[PDB]
């Protein structure tokens, strides 16, 4: 059924599974019109589809042309997400298709179930976790590829860079969510933390800097302080 703190280790077992987050699928800027009314301009977006065990990120870039002439875009976005996830599954060899797909928002359940009726053995599930995947557009290289796209495009990343060489997927995911949580709560501070030391660089084939184990521990502590810091600033504590 739903995914929560009790069955959190299921994410890292050997049953193939994907998280789907649709929060950056339909993105807009709101602005005033010459007449003084308000209007939206869409900008490119992405479906965020992640294997939590391997780190494989299937970034489906959503070009603004897919909204042209369409109505009720926030509802269409959910059906377009589901369509694209269904096409991704269908493109994968049977032995690579997920046994479960976990959607980060419950509004995705019915769109995805309907698009996957052909796959009655793939379980579509919600989660009680509050995952910070909306912050994925704060990762510069993922933001850059979405905003540069001139047509629909799928780009494949490993959001864990080479971490699994040294840590488990449980720890890699915990690091990812703590980084994304920090970027979501205070992007400027988070980026400042991540880049303050120019001797630590991001390899061209990576998204995050090349920290040693010890430097990751420091980094992880500073992200926790930031999250705690902002929690105080927010609530006056």
């Amino acid at each position: 059924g739903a995914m929560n703190s009790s069955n959190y280790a299921e994410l890292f077992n050997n049953d193939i599974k994907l998280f789907v987050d649709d929060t950056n699928v339909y993105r807009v800027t709101v602005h005033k019109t010459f007449e003084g009314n308000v209007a939206t301009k869409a900008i490119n977006g992405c479906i965020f589809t992640l294997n939590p065990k391997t780190g494989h990120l299937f970034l489906k870039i959503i070009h603004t042309s897919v909204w042209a002439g369409q109505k009720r875009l926030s509802q269409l976005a959910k059906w377009k997400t589901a369509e694209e996830v269904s096409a991704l599954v269908r493109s994968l060899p049977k032995e690579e298709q997920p046994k479960q797909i976990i959607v980060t928002r419950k509004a995705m359940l019915d769109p995805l179930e309907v698009h996957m009726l052909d796959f009655p053995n793939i379980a579509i599930r919600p989660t009680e976790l509050r995952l910070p995947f909306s912050a994925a557009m704060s990762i510069d290289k993922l933001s850059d590829v979405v905003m540069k796209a001139t047509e629909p495009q799928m780009v494949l990343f490993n959001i864990y860079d080479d971490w699994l060489d040294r840590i488990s997927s449980y720890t890699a995911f915990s690091r990812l969510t703590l980084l994304l949580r920090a970027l979501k709560t205070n992007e400027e501070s988070a980026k400042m933390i991540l880049l303050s030391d120019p001797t630590i660089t991001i390899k061209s084939y990576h998204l995050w800097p090349s920290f040693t184990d010890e430097q990751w521990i420091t980094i992880e502590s500073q992200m926790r302080d930031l999250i705690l810091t902002e929690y105080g600033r927010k609530y006056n504590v």
């Binding site: 269409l76 059906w79 589901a82 369509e83 019915d110 769109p111 179930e113 309907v114 009726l117 052909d118």
Partner: protein, 300 residues
């Protein structure tokens, strides 16, 4: 006018005939019901005084043969049977009538209730939903399950209603996923009306039969089927104008008939609020919305 004689009434029982109920006491001199309007289906139905568990009953049409009721002390229920000896039957009935051992179907002459609840119900269609082909009448009870309930267990004793499932491949065309799920006109008009029911009269007949089973026996699967068939219409953007007018009339008389005390379990809050206030047809059921708001404003 036609008659359903009873051999006897050995156990105290609540007898339902269509929308009416009356009490017979253990070993009372009761020998049946007379003046039953020819021309409609009917349902006789029972609720034992000593075990209100399992209401049960029989759908029949008096034009299709001479039927009577006889208590069976082994199976412990009032059973419908057919008398094939016509002259025996007329003789039996005439005697009971002369001795005034029969209550009379007391149809008020201003009253079109039963017709309005069974307008599209046909015995032949009932017999396909309730499979037991050696009898001309059809037994139903509170606990019988539906074909769809068994998919989600004795297939001979099932209600074979038409399976409706909005998240099924039958309901959803490849490539039109969002269109067909948010507006179910394809599923209603092409799959169900043209494909399965052939016309809206058979569709309405099943819907009416499902409600009646739902209200008379508290058959839960029947209640699910009734609500499903309403929701399929209300959720279709394109519905023939005459179907909507008829559906409004059908639902109006079902709600009017629905006893006030029985509404908390027979009326699905989600389906009705959706149908009356959110769906495509939210403005097309004036009579039904007016009676629902005045009779059951709690549910809304």
């Amino acid at each position: 006018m036609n008659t359903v004689p009873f051999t006897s009434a050995p156990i105290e029982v609540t007898i339902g005939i269509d929308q009416y109920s009356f009490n017979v006491k253990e070993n009372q001199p009761f020998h049946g019901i007379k003046d039953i309007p020819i021309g409609h289906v009917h349902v006789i139905h029972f609720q034992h005084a000593d075990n209100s568990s399992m209401r049960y009953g029989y759908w029949f049409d008096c034009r299709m043969g001479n039927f009577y009721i006889q208590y069976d002390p082994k199976d412990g229920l009032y059973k419908m049977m057919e008398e094939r000896d016509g002259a025996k039957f007329e003789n039996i009935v005439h005697n009971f009538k002369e001795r005034q051992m029969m209550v009379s179907y007391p149809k008020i002459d201003e009253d079109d209730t039963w017709y309005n609840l069974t307008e599209f119900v046909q015995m032949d269609k009932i017999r396909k939903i309730v499979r037991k082909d050696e009898n001309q009448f059809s037994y139903v009870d509170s606990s019988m399950t539906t074909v769809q309930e068994n998919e989600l267990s004795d297939p001979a004793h099932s209600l074979n209603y038409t399976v409706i499932n909005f998240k099924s491949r039958e309901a959803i065309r490849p490539g039109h996923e969002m269109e067909d799920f948010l507006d179910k006109s394809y599923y209603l008009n092409t799959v169900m009306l043209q494909g399965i029911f052939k016309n809206s009269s058979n569709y309405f007949g099943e819907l009416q039969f499902a409600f009646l089973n739902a209200m008379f026996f508290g058959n839960y699967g029947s209640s699910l089927q009734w609500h499903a068939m309403i929701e399929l219409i209300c959720s279709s953007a394109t519905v023939p104008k005459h179907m909507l007018d008829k559906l409004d009339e059908i639902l109006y008389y079902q709600i009017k008939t629905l006893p006030e005390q029985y509404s908390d379990i027979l009326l699905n809050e989600r389906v009705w609020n959706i149908c009356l206030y959110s769906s495509f047809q939210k403005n097309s059921l004036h009579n039904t919305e007016k009676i629902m708001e005045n009779k059951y404003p709690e549910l809304l």
